[PDB]
Design a protein around this motif. Sequence first.
Motif, PDB file in Angstrom:
ATOM      1  N   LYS A   5       7.466  -3.710   1.982  1.00  0.00           N
ATOM      2  CA  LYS A   5       7.984  -3.676   0.752  1.00  0.00           C
ATOM      3  C   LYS A   5       6.812  -2.869  -0.226  1.00  0.00           C
ATOM      4  O   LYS A   5       5.626  -3.506  -0.412  1.00  0.00           O
ATOM      5  CB  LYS A   5       8.279  -5.080  -0.129  1.00  0.00           C
ATOM      6  CG  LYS A   5       8.689  -5.067  -1.477  1.00  0.00           C
ATOM      7  CD  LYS A   5      10.128  -4.232  -1.511  1.00  0.00           C
ATOM      8  CE  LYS A   5      11.310  -4.983  -0.808  1.00  0.00           C
ATOM      9  NZ  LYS A   5      11.272  -6.418  -1.305  1.00  0.00           N
ATOM     10  N   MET A   6       7.049  -1.680  -0.503  1.00  0.00           N
ATOM     11  CA  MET A   6       6.105  -0.690  -0.881  1.00  0.00           C
ATOM     12  C   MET A   6       6.311  -0.091  -2.281  1.00  0.00           C
ATOM     13  O   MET A   6       7.704   0.186  -2.581  1.00  0.00           O
ATOM     14  CB  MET A   6       6.075   0.552  -0.048  1.00  0.00           C
ATOM     15  CG  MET A   6       4.983   1.407  -0.137  1.00  0.00           C
ATOM     16  SD  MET A   6       5.223   2.636   1.272  1.00  0.00           S
ATOM     17  CE  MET A   6       4.712   1.862   2.909  1.00  0.00           C
ATOM     18  N   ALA A   7       5.397   0.010  -2.944  1.00  0.00           N
ATOM     19  CA  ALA A   7       5.612   0.218  -4.513  1.00  0.00           C
ATOM     20  C   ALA A   7       4.869   1.766  -4.613  1.00  0.00           C
ATOM     21  O   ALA A   7       4.221   2.281  -3.606  1.00  0.00           O
ATOM     22  CB  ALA A   7       4.683  -0.655  -5.411  1.00  0.00           C
ATOM     23  N   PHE A   8       5.292   2.692  -5.886  1.00  0.00           N
ATOM     24  CA  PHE A   8       4.680   3.868  -5.804  1.00  0.00           C
ATOM     25  C   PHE A   8       3.152   3.625  -6.148  1.00  0.00           C
ATOM     26  O   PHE A   8       2.792   2.530  -6.653  1.00  0.00           O
ATOM     27  CB  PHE A   8       5.453   4.580  -6.837  1.00  0.00           C
ATOM     28  CG  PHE A   8       6.716   4.923  -6.397  1.00  0.00           C
ATOM     29  CD1 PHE A   8       7.155   6.133  -5.494  1.00  0.00           C
ATOM     30  CD2 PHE A   8       7.909   4.174  -6.682  1.00  0.00           C
ATOM     31  CE1 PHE A   8       8.154   6.728  -5.297  1.00  0.00           C
ATOM     32  CE2 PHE A   8       9.170   4.829  -6.123  1.00  0.00           C
ATOM     33  CZ  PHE A   8       9.244   5.849  -5.732  1.00  0.00           C
ATOM     34  N   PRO A   9       2.447   4.509  -5.650  1.00  0.00           N
ATOM     35  CA  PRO A   9       1.126   4.587  -6.318  1.00  0.00           C
ATOM     36  C   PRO A   9       1.109   4.562  -7.763  1.00  0.00           C
ATOM     37  O   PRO A   9       2.026   5.047  -8.212  1.00  0.00           O
ATOM     38  CB  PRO A   9       0.419   6.075  -5.918  1.00  0.00           C
ATOM     39  CG  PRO A   9       1.078   6.318  -4.523  1.00  0.00           C
ATOM     40  CD  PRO A   9       2.777   5.847  -5.083  1.00  0.00           C
ATOM     41  N   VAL A 125       0.842  -4.383  -9.022  1.00  0.00           N
ATOM     42  CA  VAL A 125       1.975  -3.405  -8.786  1.00  0.00           C
ATOM     43  C   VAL A 125       2.929  -4.266  -7.535  1.00  0.00           C
ATOM     44  O   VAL A 125       2.016  -4.588  -6.588  1.00  0.00           O
ATOM     45  CB  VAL A 125       1.919  -2.129  -8.459  1.00  0.00           C
ATOM     46  CG1 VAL A 125       1.036  -1.729  -7.418  1.00  0.00           C
ATOM     47  CG2 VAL A 125       2.874  -1.074  -8.461  1.00  0.00           C
ATOM     48  N   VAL A 303       7.074  10.284   2.767  1.00  0.00           N
ATOM     49  CA  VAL A 303       7.265  11.447   1.436  1.00  0.00           C
ATOM     50  C   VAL A 303       5.998  10.828   0.573  1.00  0.00           C
ATOM     51  O   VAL A 303       5.869   9.697   0.415  1.00  0.00           O
ATOM     52  CB  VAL A 303       8.682  11.194   0.824  1.00  0.00           C
ATOM     53  CG1 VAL A 303       8.584  12.179  -0.481  1.00  0.00           C
ATOM     54  CG2 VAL A 303       9.859  11.608   1.569  1.00  0.00           C
TER      55      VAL A 303
ATOM     56  N   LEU B 115      -3.272   1.527   0.388  1.00  0.00           N
ATOM     57  CA  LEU B 115      -2.733   2.832  -0.221  1.00  0.00           C
ATOM     58  C   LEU B 115      -2.398   3.739   1.015  1.00  0.00           C
ATOM     59  O   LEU B 115      -3.270   4.458   1.561  1.00  0.00           O
ATOM     60  CB  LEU B 115      -3.554   3.384  -1.117  1.00  0.00           C
ATOM     61  CG  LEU B 115      -3.055   4.730  -2.002  1.00  0.00           C
ATOM     62  CD1 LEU B 115      -1.821   4.283  -2.623  1.00  0.00           C
ATOM     63  CD2 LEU B 115      -4.139   5.653  -2.590  1.00  0.00           C
ATOM     64  N   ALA B 116      -1.146   3.811   1.520  1.00  0.00           N
ATOM     65  CA  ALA B 116      -0.404   4.622   2.616  1.00  0.00           C
ATOM     66  C   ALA B 116      -0.768   5.968   1.768  1.00  0.00           C
ATOM     67  O   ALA B 116      -0.045   6.520   0.897  1.00  0.00           O
ATOM     68  CB  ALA B 116       0.860   4.352   3.059  1.00  0.00           C
ATOM     69  N   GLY B 124       2.502   5.380  -0.983  1.00  0.00           N
ATOM     70  CA  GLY B 124       2.822   4.093  -1.456  1.00  0.00           C
ATOM     71  C   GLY B 124       1.706   3.023  -1.311  1.00  0.00           C
ATOM     72  O   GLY B 124       0.835   3.427  -0.782  1.00  0.00           O
ATOM     73  N   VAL B 125       2.027   1.842  -2.099  1.00  0.00           N
ATOM     74  CA  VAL B 125       0.984   0.641  -1.883  1.00  0.00           C
ATOM     75  C   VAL B 125       1.834  -0.584  -1.626  1.00  0.00           C
ATOM     76  O   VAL B 125       2.802  -0.898  -2.234  1.00  0.00           O
ATOM     77  CB  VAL B 125       0.040   0.563  -3.340  1.00  0.00           C
ATOM     78  CG1 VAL B 125       0.794   0.159  -4.306  1.00  0.00           C
ATOM     79  CG2 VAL B 125      -0.993  -0.196  -3.264  1.00  0.00           C
TER      80      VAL B 125
END
Lengths: 304, 304
Positions: A5-9, A125, A303, B115-116, B124-125
Motif C-alpha cells: 500500500k504505497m503513497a506518492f512521495p 503519509v 512509474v 522511499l522506492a 512511492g513511500v
Amino acid sequence: SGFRKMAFPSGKVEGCMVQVTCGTTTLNGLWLDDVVYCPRHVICTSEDMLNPNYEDLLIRKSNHNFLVQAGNVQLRVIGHSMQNCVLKLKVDTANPKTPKYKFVRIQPGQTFSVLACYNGSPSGVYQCAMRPNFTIKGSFLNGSCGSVGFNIDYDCVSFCYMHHMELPTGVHAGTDLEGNFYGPFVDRQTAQAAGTDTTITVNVLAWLYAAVINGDRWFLNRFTTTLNDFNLVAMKYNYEPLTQDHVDILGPLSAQTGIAVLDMCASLKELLQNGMNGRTILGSALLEDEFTPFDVVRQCSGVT
Amino acid sequence: SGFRKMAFPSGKVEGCMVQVTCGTTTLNGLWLDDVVYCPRHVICTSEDMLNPNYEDLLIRKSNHNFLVQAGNVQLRVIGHSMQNCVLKLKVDTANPKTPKYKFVRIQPGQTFSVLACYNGSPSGVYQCAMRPNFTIKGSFLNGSCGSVGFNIDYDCVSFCYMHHMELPTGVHAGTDLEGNFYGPFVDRQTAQAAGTDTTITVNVLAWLYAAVINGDRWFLNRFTTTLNDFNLVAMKYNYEPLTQDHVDILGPLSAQTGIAVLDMCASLKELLQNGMNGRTILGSALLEDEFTPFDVVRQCSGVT
Ligand SMILES: *CC(=O)N1CCN(S(=O)(=O)c2cccs2)CC1
Ligand SMILES: *CC(=O)N1CCN(S(=O)(=O)c2cccs2)CC1
C-alpha cells in the motif's frame, strides 16, 4: 517483486502546507501561488459548529484576523473569500515551492495519498480511497483539518481532497479544492450517517491481478462467469456492480497475466462464497479494494 | 480517530536521491553532504553477481566510471571507497538539500518508511518492519536498489536501510548505511533462504491498544495471563517471546487505555486460539505486527 500500500512521495505537498489560525481555532492550509486554501470552519468556535451561518460569521472577520504561518514566517493576508466550504486567503507572496498542480474532483473507488498535518507541519503519509458512500477511512486527530489528498502525474500534483469532518462513526468527510463536499455531508456538528460502505469490485480484481503477478496464485480456479452472474453474487456481498467500463480498465492486467477478466471474476466469486479458509493474498486475510487498476500497473511497472 | 499504516513525509529523503550508473548498471544513490552512498553491486554485470570478488572488480573502476546524476545535473566524482557492501562516492558538491541525519542500525521488529526510487526518482513511500529473520517485505522492481529506509525525529532523518537484494521467495534483504547486511545475507546471486518469519508480538499488542483507542473493542475478554503462560501460546503460534522490556515499552498505552499489558496478552492469546471468526480489527482480518508501540503513540497523539 512484492506489493505494498504505497503513497506518492509527499515532498511537493509538504512544501505547500501552512498553519491557519482564526481566533483560537488552528488548522492546516494549502499555499499554491498567492492563495491559501483552508476549511471555512476555521472561523467557527466549536459552539458555532452546532448550526453555523458561515456568511454571517465571515462578516465579523477581516484579512488581519486570518493568521497564516509558513514554517516560522507569517504571510500577509491581502484578501479572503468563501468558495463553497473552503476559504481562499490571498497572500502578498506566491509560494516559491508551488508545484505544477490541478484541482480534480475524484469518483468513488479512486485512491489518493493523504499528507496528515498538525499546525501546518506534516506528520505522515498514507493511501486512501474515496468509499462508494463518499467517506474516506483516514487517520485524523483534532488539528488535522485542511490536510489534503492528492495524486501525482510525474511533476503535476492533482489535489482531490481537503479534510473537514469526522462522522460519529469515526470515518471522514471532506471537500475537493473548490470546497464541495464529497457526498451529502455538511460542515455542521449534526447527525450525519454514512450509507453502505460497499467493496470496490474493480479494485479487488486489480489487486487479485497484482497477487498473480507477485506469485500469490492459490485462489485461481477452473471457472469463469458472466458480468450478470458475477453481479448477482456482488449484490449479495455488498460489492459494487462490475461494468464493461471496469472490464475494459482491467484489460492491460488481463493481457499481462493472460487471465480473462471474467475468469478472475469467477475466482473472486469463489472467494466471496468460500472465504479465504485462513489463507492470505499479498499478506492480507481480506480482499483489498484500495488499489485501482492504474495503481496496480503503476506499482508493478515502477512509474516515477 | 482512525488508524492507518503511515509513512514519514518523504520530502527530506526525496532531496537526497540520485542516479548512479557504473557501465550498464543503473540504480539509486543517497547524496548526503559530499558523499553518494549506493550498493557496491553497481560495479557488477549480472554475470559477476554469481560469485563477485568486489575488491578485484573495483580495481578496474575509476572515479570517472561512476556517473552520478542529481535531477538532470551530473555530479563530479573526486573519490570512491568500499565500506562493507556500499560504495561511498565523494563528489565535489555538498547536497544543498542535506537534512540533519544519522545512520542507525535498527533491531528486528523496528518499523521504517521506504522511499522506492527508479533512476534516482521517487515513485512511492510505504511503511515496513525489519522482520525477525532480518528480511523486509518490500515493493522493489529492478532499478530500485539503493532505495533507503528511514525514520524521522522532527528534523533529523535516521537512515536505517538501503535496498540490495530480492531473495528467490520475493522478500527483500539490504544493509544499514555502513553497508552491513541485516541478517546473514550476501550481495551474491546464490541460494539464500530466510528463517522463520515470526510475528512481532509487542507490535501486535501495540496495534491492539490502537484498536481500543480507536473504538474497536470486541476482542477484549475477561481473562488475564502471565508472561510465561502467554509465551507458551506465542511459541506455538511462531510469535516472538514477550519480555518485561516489551511490557515496560507498552506502559504508556496501558496507562492511556487502563488495560493491563497482561490482560491485553490474554486477549491476544484468545485471538490466536479462537481466530477472528470472520471479524476485523482496524479494517484487518489478521493481527498487524508492523506498528511499534512508538508508532502507535506517535499516530494516536499526532507528532509532526
Ligand atoms: C478539524 C480540525 O482539525 N480542527 C477544528 C477543531 N479545532 S479545535 O476546536 O481547536 C479543537 C481542538 C481539540 C478539540 S476541538 C482544531 C482544528
Ligand atoms: C538491484 C537493482 O535495482 N539493480 C541491479 C540490477 N540491474 S540490471 O542488471 O540492470 C537489471 C535490470 C533488469 C533486470 S536486471 C538494475 C539495478
